[PDB]
Structure formats: C-alpha cells, structure tokens
Design an enzyme around this catalytic site. Structure first.
Site, PDB file in Angstrom:
ATOM      1  N   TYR A 133       5.161  -6.343  17.392  1.00  0.00           N
ATOM      2  CA  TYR A 133       4.382  -5.339  16.673  1.00  0.00           C
ATOM      3  C   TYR A 133       5.236  -4.110  16.389  1.00  0.00           C
ATOM      4  O   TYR A 133       5.978  -3.641  17.258  1.00  0.00           O
ATOM      5  CB  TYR A 133       3.186  -4.969  17.550  1.00  0.00           C
ATOM      6  N   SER A 163       7.375 -10.666  22.282  1.00  0.00           N
ATOM      7  CA  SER A 163       6.106 -10.033  22.617  1.00  0.00           C
ATOM      8  C   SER A 163       4.990 -10.591  21.750  1.00  0.00           C
ATOM      9  O   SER A 163       4.617 -11.744  21.938  1.00  0.00           O
ATOM     10  CB  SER A 163       6.195  -8.513  22.549  1.00  0.00           C
ATOM     11  N   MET A 164       4.429  -9.820  20.816  1.00  0.00           N
ATOM     12  CA  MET A 164       3.418 -10.432  19.952  1.00  0.00           C
ATOM     13  C   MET A 164       3.995 -11.601  19.149  1.00  0.00           C
ATOM     14  O   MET A 164       3.260 -12.526  18.789  1.00  0.00           O
ATOM     15  CB  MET A 164       2.798  -9.401  19.007  1.00  0.00           C
ATOM     16  N   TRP A 168       3.333 -11.515  24.679  1.00  0.00           N
ATOM     17  CA  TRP A 168       2.045 -10.793  24.685  1.00  0.00           C
ATOM     18  C   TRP A 168       1.077 -11.533  23.771  1.00  0.00           C
ATOM     19  O   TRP A 168       1.476 -11.983  22.714  1.00  0.00           O
ATOM     20  CB  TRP A 168       2.185  -9.346  24.212  1.00  0.00           C
ATOM     21  N   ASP A 214       8.582  -4.572  32.589  1.00  0.00           N
ATOM     22  CA  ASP A 214       7.867  -4.440  31.294  1.00  0.00           C
ATOM     23  C   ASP A 214       6.566  -3.649  31.472  1.00  0.00           C
ATOM     24  O   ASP A 214       5.729  -4.062  32.274  1.00  0.00           O
ATOM     25  CB  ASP A 214       7.541  -5.821  30.733  1.00  0.00           C
ATOM     26  N   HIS A 257      10.675  -3.681  28.468  1.00  0.00           N
ATOM     27  CA  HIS A 257      10.080  -4.586  27.479  1.00  0.00           C
ATOM     28  C   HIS A 257      11.085  -5.166  26.490  1.00  0.00           C
ATOM     29  O   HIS A 257      10.909  -6.302  26.039  1.00  0.00           O
ATOM     30  CB  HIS A 257       8.986  -3.838  26.727  1.00  0.00           C
TER      31      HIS A 257
END
Length: 264
Positions: free
Chosen positions: A59, A132-133, A157, A178, A209
C-alpha cells in the site's frame, strides 16, 4: 534429466552473490493490461524457456520498493515482472487480480514476435511474490490459482490470516519488529494456517516492516532463500533442495520454521 534445470550447480556463494550466471535485460510494458505499470526483467541466455514471476508492492508503494528482486531472480533464470498497481491505495484482493493480470500479459508477450521475451517463457510455470498487502495478494493468488508453482509473500498483510486451502509451496519472509503488519497477528498465523503445502517461515532478526524491500541489508540471505525456493519449486530443481529447505544458520534469522520440505 530435468527439462527445467538451468544454470550451474548451486553453492552458497553462487546464491548469496548479487547476481546469478545469466545476463539480464529489462523493458517497460507499453500498454499494461489489468494493472498500472510494469517492468519485465529477463535472462538473455538461459539455455531454455524459464518460468515467470509477478511481484506486487504494498500500500502506497511502487516498483522501487520491490525491484531488487527483478535482477536477482532473472539472473538465475526467471522472467520477472514488477508492477505498479492501478492505484497505490488498492487492497489485497485487487492487488491479486492485478498480479494475475501481470502474469497473463507476460504469457501474451511470450507469443508476441516483437517482444524481447518472445518464446523465452514457459507459460505453464508461474509464481507470485509481493510485499505486505502485495504479500496478501500473493497468498490470495495462490489460494485462487493452485497451478502456481511457488509463492513468496514478504512481511504479509491481509484482512484475514486463514489461507488453509493453499497447496502452492509458500515461503514467508517476516520482519521480527514489524509494527505495520505485526508477525504475531499476520505473518506467523498466516504461515500456521497452511497445512496442505510445502512451506517455510523465515523471520529477519530485528527487522522493521521494510526488511525485505529494495536496499535492505540482508540481500545475501534473503536473495539466497528466494532464488533457492523458486529453483526448487518452479523448476523442480532438486539441486536446490538443501538450500530451499534448510535452516540457513544465520545470526540474521530470529525464527525459522518449515514443513513438508523434502531436504533430499
């Protein structure tokens, strides 16, 4: 003999180096279909068709954050497309659709006589990665597309942690400290939800992260494991079984888990 095996017999040094044996070229996709933008990295001299990998950032992030994987993987015999999403605010489900659209366009370009990757791709052998996303997107891609040969989400994520249907060999990179996608509520439970696949969990000691993004200080270890995983599972290359399935014995690793990983 393995029709998919490419390159010399691996060593720790060959996997930890900045580049594999093959010469890498790249180009920008002219008319991206189903996603925002893309860069394709490819080996010029792999000695046969190779699998392709689509990598999705997180993101409010762009290709720069994940692009180090492009040269690193392509130089070991893979075609890699790094993408920008239609919007940097896209959520995992949308990111997954765009990731598969990116694989589709690499497969279409394989059949395009004017493309630099004309006939260079084994379009039956595809893999997914993302941050992540974009890691959640990769897990969704794997759950929805079981013919995928491998998945490598990093600092994943998603709005859910249950990916129990995934049968695709999945290596999860986690960042110990993270604070955006905490390991205790994201990477670890996601890893633990998969009981039907070869899988691995590698947590970077003290990592924030962005611990597996471009510019990270562990590209030797992280690149070794990512390339080994894709070799073992996208190419069925058992020369890489030990590198893919082993504990790396690194002071940079704070947690290591693995299941259903041959190691032979």
């Amino acid at each position: 003999t393995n029709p998919y095996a490419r390159g010399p017999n691996p060593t720790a040094a060959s996997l930890e180096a900045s580049a594999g044996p093959f010469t890498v070229r790249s180009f920008t996709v002219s008319r991206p279909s189903g996603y925002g933008a893309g860069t394709v990295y490819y080996p010029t001299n792999a000695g046969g068709t190779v699998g392709a990998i689509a990598i999705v950032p997180g993101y409010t992030a762009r290709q720069s954050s994940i692009k180090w994987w492009g040269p690193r993987l392509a130089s070991h015999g893979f075609v890699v497309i790094t993408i920008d999403t239609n919007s940097t605010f896209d959520y995992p489900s949308s990111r997954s659709s765009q990731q598969m659209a990116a694989l589709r366009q690499v497969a279409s370009l394989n059949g395009d006589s004017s493309s630099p990757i004309y006939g260079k791709v084994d379009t039956a052998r595809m893999g997914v990665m993302g941050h992540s996303m974009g890691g959640g997107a990769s897990l969704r891609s794997a759950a929805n597309n079981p013919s995928l040969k491998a998945a490598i989400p990093q600092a994943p994520w998603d709005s859910q942690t249950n990916f129990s249907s995934v049968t695709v060999p999945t290596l999860i990179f986690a960042c110990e400290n993270d604070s955006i996608a905490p390991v205790n509520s994201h990477a670890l439970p996601i890893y633990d939800s998969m009981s039907r696949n070869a899988k691995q969990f590698l947590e970077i000691n003290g990592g924030s992260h962005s611990c597996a993004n471009s510019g990270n200080s562990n590209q030797a270890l992280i690149g070794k494991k990512g390339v080994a995983w894709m070799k073992r599972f996208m190419d069925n290359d058992t020369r890489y079984s030990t590198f893919a399935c082993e504990n790396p014995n690194s002071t940079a690793v704070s947690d290591f888990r693995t299941a259903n990983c041959s190691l032979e």
